[PDB]
Amino acid sequence: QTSQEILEARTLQPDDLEKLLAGVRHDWLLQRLENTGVLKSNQLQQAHSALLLKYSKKSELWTAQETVVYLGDYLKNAFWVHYLHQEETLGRYVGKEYKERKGLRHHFTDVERQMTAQHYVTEFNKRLYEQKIPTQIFYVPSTILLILEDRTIKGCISVEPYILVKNEYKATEYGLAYGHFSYEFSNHRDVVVDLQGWVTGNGKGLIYLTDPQIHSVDQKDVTTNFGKRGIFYFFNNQHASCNEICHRLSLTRPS
Amino acid sequence: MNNQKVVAVLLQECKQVLDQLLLEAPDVSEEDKSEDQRCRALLPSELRTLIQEAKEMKWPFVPEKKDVIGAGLQQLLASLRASILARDCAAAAAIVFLVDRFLYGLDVSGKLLQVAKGLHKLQPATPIAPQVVIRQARISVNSGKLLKAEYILSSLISNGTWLYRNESDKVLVQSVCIQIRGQILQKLGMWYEAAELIWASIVGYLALPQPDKKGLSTSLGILADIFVSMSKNDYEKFKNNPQINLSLLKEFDHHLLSAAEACKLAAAFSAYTPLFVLTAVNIRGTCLLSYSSSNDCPPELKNLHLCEAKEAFEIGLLTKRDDEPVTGKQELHSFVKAAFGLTTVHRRLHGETGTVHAASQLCKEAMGKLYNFSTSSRSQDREALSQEVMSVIAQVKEHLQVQSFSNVDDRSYVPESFECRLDKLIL
Ligand SMILES: Nc1ncnc2c1ncn2[C@@H]1O[C@H](COP(=O)(O)OP(=O)(O)O[C@@H]2O[C@H]([C@H](O)CO)[C@@H](O)[C@H](O)[C@@H]2O)[C@@H](O)[C@H]1O
Ligand SMILES: [Zn+2]
C-alpha cells in the first residue's frame, strides 16, 4: 500500500461512519480495518473523541456510538478511563492500548469470542435462577474504543470495569457445569472453559469468569482454537463425571 | 452529615440491640428513660409528628411532599440510639422507617437494615414498614442476590404483621414489589416477562385513587430500558398482546421509538424533579440517535427524529439554571452526556462544522473537569470542580443556542408538549 492507501484506511468517510452507526457485519468490519497499520499511542490525562463499538451475538452486527473518553493516569500497561457511555457510570474503568503488530482483526475476533462466552453466561444464569440456585457467574467482556481525531482513526483501546462458607456448590462445580451447559445449549458445537480455573469468587453468590477459551467445532476467523480435541479433553479430563448442578439443570453425558 | 459517621453509629445500634437480646432482663435505668426523653424532645416539633405518624402506620412509604431528614439526621440517630437503650422498639423502628429513604442515598442501607433486623429480633411484635422490607430486596438486587430478593418480596405480599387502614395501600405495595420483580427479570435478560411485570406495576399505580406519579415515572423508565434491550420479536409479541393496552405500543411500530416515548412519559410524570427529567431525556435522545441512524428509519424521517433527539438533550441541559449548584457525580455525568448528545445531533445533521468542533472541544474540556471531580476527596475540590463542569455546560448551551421553553407551570422542567398523559396512558 501507498501512503494514500493508508490514509484512506484510517479515514472513515461519511458512508463508512453511516454503516458503522447502523450496524455492520463482522466480516465487513474485519475487512475495513485489516490494513490499518499500528496506531500510535494515545495521550494520557486528556479527553478524546471515540467510537464505542459493540458486537451483538444475536444480530451478528457491530454497532458504533460516538462517545467521549478521558484517559487518566497509569495504574501503579493499564490506565484509568472514564467514558460517557460506560455501563456503571459510578464505577471505575481500566483501559489498555492495543498495539500488537499482528493486526486489529485479532482484537475484534477476541471480542467476538468474549461476546460468545458472555452469551452462554447469560443463558446459564437464567437456568440457575429457574432451578432456584442462588448463584450467578459474573463476566463482562471488554469494550473497544476507536479514538478518532475528526474522521481519522488515531487509536484503539480496550476497556474493562475495574473489579479487583457460601456452600451448596464450589466455584469449580459452577464453572464446569457452565462448560457442560455451553456444550448442550450450543447444540454440541462449543465448550467454554476458564483458563484461570474459577479460583476467585467474592462475598456473595458470584463466581467470576476471567479468561474464557472456546473449544469449537466451527473455525471462523483466525482465532486459535483447540476445537474437537478440546471438547473431548473437557469431557474426559476436566468434566469427567458431572456434578449436582449438571443434574439440577438436566445435563446429560455426550460421547 | 457524613457517610462514615452514620455507618459507625448505625453499627453500634446493632451491636447493642444484639446485647439486649442476650443480656436481657430489661433492667433499664432512670438515666436511660431520661436520655430517651432527652433526645426525643430535641427533635424539631415536626419530626416528632412524623415519628408519631410512622409509629401508627399512616402509610407504607414515607410521603415525599426530605430536607427535614437531612437536617435532623444527627438528632434522629441519637434519639434512635436512646430509644433503643430504653427498649422503646416502636419508636426506634419508626425512626428507621423515617431515615430509610435518605440513607439509601447515603449508601448505608445495609447498616440500617441490620438495625431493623435487630429490632425485630428483640421483639417480633414491632411493625417494620413495607418500605424497609422492600429496601432489603433493593440492596439484594443491587448485589446480584436475585433469588433472595424474590423471597423477600414474596414474604411481604403474604406473610409479626403490618396493616393498612386502606385498600389502595395494599395494592401500592404490591405494585412496587411487582416493579422490582420486573427489574429482577431485567437483570437476567428476560426482557419480555420483565416487561409484563413492569406493565402490571403500571396498571397498579394507575388503579390508585390518586395515581402514584413517582412509581409511574420509575416504571416507565424501566420499561423504556427494557424496550431498548428487547429483540424485535420480543417487541412484536408484547405489542400484539391483547392484555397490554398501552398507547406507546399502538402508536409506534419500533422498539426504539416506543422506548423514546416511554422516556417522554417518564420525564413528564417526574416534571418537578429535575434529576429524573434529565435522566429520562438522555435515554430518549440516545434512543432517537440510535433509531435515526438505523436502517429502520425512513430517510425522509431522519431529520425529524434527529430534531426530536436535539429537543430531548436540550430539555436535559435546561434542567439546571445557569449558576446553580450540582452535587452528585451521577447528575454531573448525565449533564456532560446531554451536552455531548446535543453536539452529536448537530454533528449528525450538519457534519463537522466550526460550531460542531467548538462544541465538541467544550465537551472534552468538561469531560476532563468531570474526571477530576470523580477522583477527588476534599470537599472544597468536589464543590469547586463541579462548578467548573457546570460552568462549561453553561458555555455549551450558549454556544449551541439552547432556547428555553416556556411552560405554564412555573416549576415544570418539561415542556407543555410532554405533559399529555394519565388518561392517555392506557386507551
Ligand atoms: N421518578 C423516578 N424515576 C426514576 N427513578 C426513580 C424515581 N424516583 C425514585 N427513583 C429511584 O428508585 C429507586 C427507589 O427509590 P426510593 O428510595 O425513593 O424508594 P421508596 O421505597 O422509599 O419509595 C417508594 O418508591 C416507589 C417508586 O416506584 C420506587 O420504587 C413509589 O411507587 C412509592 O410510592 C414509594 O415512594 C431509587 O434508586 C430512586 O433514586
Ligand atoms: Zn456434566
Q: What is the 3-state secondary structure (H, E, C) of chain B?
A: CCHHHHHHHHHHHHHHHHHHHHHCCCCCCHHHHHHHHHHHHCCCCCHHHHHHHHHCCCCCCCCCCCHHHHHCHHHHHHHHHHHHHCCCHHHHHHHHHHHHHHHHCCCCHHHHHHHHHHHHHHCCCCCCCHHHHHHHHHHHHHCCCHHHHHHHHHHHHCCCCCCCCCCHHHHHHHHHHHHHHHHHHHHCCCHHHHHHHHHHHHHHHHHCCCCCHHHHHHHHHHHHHHHHHCCHHHHHHHHHCCCCCEHHHHHCCCHHHHHHHHHHHHHHCCCCCHHHHHHHHHHHHHHHHHHHCCCCCCHHHHHHHHHHHHHHHHHHHCCCCCCCCCCCHHHHHHHHHHHHHHHHHHHHHHCCCHHHHHHHHHHHHHHHHHHHHHCCCCHHHHHHHHHHHHHHHHHHHHHHCCCCCCCCCCCCCCCHHHHCCHHHCEC
Give B301's DSSP letter: G
Spatial distance between the Cα atoms of B119 and B21, rounded to a whole number of angstroms:
9
B330 touches A: beta carbon within 8 Å: yes
In a domain, A215, yes or no: no
Residue B329 is labelled as binding a ligand: no
Determination technique used: X-ray
Residue with the nearest Cα to atom 13 of ligand 1?
Answer: B218
Q: Which residues have a C–N gap over 2.5 Å right after them in chain B?
A: 65, 159
For residue A220, give the C-alpha cell.
471462523
Q: Which residues have CB under 8 Å from B300's CB, separation 6+? A: none
Residue numbers after which chain A is interrupted (C to N above 2.5 A) read 76, 164
As for how many domains chain A has, the answer is 1
Q: Indicate the pairing of strand A61-74 with strand A78-83.
A: antiparallel
Q: Answer for the pair A112, A222: CB distance below 8 angstroms, yes or no.
A: no
Q: Are A49 and A42 in contact (CB under 8 A)?
A: no
Nearest Cα to A120, choosing from A201, A200, A208, A57?
Answer: A57
* Contact in structure between B3 and B108 (CB atoms under 8 Å): yes
Tell me if residue A216 falls in helix, strand or coil.
strand
Contact between residue A48 and residue A147 where contact means Cβ atoms under 8 Å apart: yes
CA-based nearest residue to A162, from A75, A84, A55 = A75
Q: Which residues of B318-329 are buried (b: 16+ CB within 10 A; e: fewer)?
A: bbbeeeeebeeb
Place of cell 427533635: B43
The C-alpha angle with vertex B281 and arms to B275 and B285, in degrees rounded to 5, equals: 145
φ, ψ of residue B164 to 5 degrees: the values are -115, 120
Alpha carbon B172 to its chain centroid, in Å, reads: 17
How wide is the angle at C-alpha A211 spanned by C-alphas A206 and A214, nearest 5°? 110
**Single-letter code of the amino acid located at A168:** E
**The length of chain B, given as a count of residues:** 427
CA angle, corner B171, sides to B261 and B90, nearest 5? 120
- The residue of chain A nearest to residue B338, with distances taken between CA atoms, is A84
CA distance B158 to B173: 11
d(CA B310, CA B4): 41
Go through chain A and tell me how many residues it has: 255
Assess if residue A34 is contained within a domain: yes
Question: Ligand 1 atom 28: the closest Cα is on which residue?
Answer: B215
Q: Is residue A253 part of a domain?
A: no
Residue nearest to atom 5 of ligand 1 (CA): B218
Q: Which grid cell is A87?
A: 455501563
Set of cell numbers at residue B196 = 409484563
Interchain CB contact of A74 with B (< 8 Å): no
End-to-end CA distance of chain A: 50
CA distance B234 to B113: 37
**Cα A28-A33-A38 angle, rounded to 5 deg:** 165
Pick the residue whose CA is nearest to atom 27 on ligand 1: B215
Contact present, A206 and A128 (Cβ < 8 Å): no
Structural domain contains residue A17: yes
Local structure of B368: helix, strand or coil: helix
Position A235: which residue type?
F
Q: List Cα–Cα distances, A8 to A2, A205, B357, B369, in angstroms.
A: 10, 50, 22, 34
To what resolution in angstroms was this structure determined? 2.2
Q: How many cross-chain Cβ pairs, A to B, lie less than 8 Å apart?
A: 82
B371 touches chain A (CB under 8 A): yes
Distance from CA of A146 to the nearest CA of B (A): 16
Residue B205 CA, ligand 1 centroid: distance in Å: 13
Instruction: Verify whether the Cβ–Cβ distance B329 to A89 is below 8 Å.
Output: yes
Cα distance between residue B271 and residue B213, in whole Å: 10
What whole-number distance in Å separates Cα of residue B415 and Cα of residue B418?
A: 6
Q: State how far the Cα of A141 lies from the Cα of A123, in Å rounded to an integer.
A: 15
Pocket mutation for ligand 1, best pick of B152, B172, B214 (most atoms within 8 Å of C-beta): B214
* Centroid of chain to Cα A158: 10
- Classify strands A206-208 and A136-138 as parallel, antiparallel or unpaired: parallel
**CA distances (Å), origin A254, targets A125, A189, B137, B279:** 22, 12, 40, 50
Cα(B52)–Cα(B416) distance, rounded to whole angstroms? 40
Place of cell 469431557: A235
Q: Test A47 with B365 for CB contact under 8 angstroms.
A: yes
Q: Judge whether A191 and A231 are in contact, CB under 8 Å.
A: yes
Q: Smallest Cα–Cα separation from B115: which of B148, B173, B98?
A: B98
Neighboring chain A residues of B147 at a CB cutoff of 8 Å: 129, 132-134
**Annotated binding residue B135:** yes
Nearest CA-CA distance, residue B366 and chain A, Å? 9
Q: Which domain holds residue A13?
A: 3-108+142-161
Dist. CA B216–CA B202, nearest whole Å: 6
Name the region of B350 (left: φ>0; alpha: ψ -120 to 50; beta: rest): alpha
* C-alpha A208 – ligand 2 centre gap (Å): 19
- Radius of gyration, CA atoms only, chain A: 20
- By C-alpha distance, which of A249, A212, A24, A196 is closest to A120? A212
Q: How far is B16 from B8, CA to CA, in rounded Å?
A: 13
Q: Do B188 and A134 touch (CB under 8 A)?
A: no
Q: Three-state SS for A105?
A: helix
Does A8 map to a domain?
yes
β-strand partners of A96: A78, A158
Q: CA-to-CA distance for B280 and B274, rounded, in angstroms?
A: 10
Record: contact A89-B333, CB cut-off 8 A:
yes
**Residues linked to residue A68 through DSSP beta bridges, in sequence order:** A49
Is residue A242 included in any domain, yes or no? no
Which residues are registered as beta bridge partners of B426? B246
Write out the residues surrounding ion ligand 2, Cβ under 5 A: A 180, 242, 246, 251
Rounded Cα gap, residues A85 and A65, in angstroms: 9
Beta bridge partners of A54: A63
CB neighbours of residue B421 within 10 Å: 17
Ligand nearest to the backbone CA of B174: 1
H/E run at residue B255: helix B255-268
B63's CB contacts (< 8 A; 6+ apart) are none
Interface of A with B in 165-194 (CB under 8 A): none
- Cα B196 to middle of ligand 1, angstroms: 19
Collapsed DSSP state (helix, strand, coil) of residue A36 = coil
Q: How far apart are CA B310 and CA B13, in angstroms?
A: 51
Q: Whose CA is nearest to atom 15 of ligand 1?
A: B101
Whether A36 is in a domain gets the answer yes
Q: Which of A84, A125, A129 sits opposite B337 (nearest CB)?
A: A84
* Residue B173, amino acid: V
Rg, C-alpha atoms of chain B: 24
CA distance between the termini of chain B: 47
Residue pair B363/B396 in contact by the 8 Å Cβ criterion: yes
C-alpha cell at A249: 439443570
List helix spans (H) across B24-161.
30-41, 47-55, 67-71, 73-85, 89-104, 109-122, 130-142, 146-157
The angle, 0 to 180 degrees and rounded to 10, between the axes of the packed helices B73-85 and B3-23 is 10
The DSSP 8-state label assigned to residue A71 in this structure reads E
A134 domain residue, yes or no: no
SS3 B407: coil
Is B136 annotated in a binding site? The answer is yes
In the 8-state DSSP scheme, what is residue A77? -
What residues of chain B lie within 8 A of the CB of A70, using their CB?
Answer: 367-368, 370-371
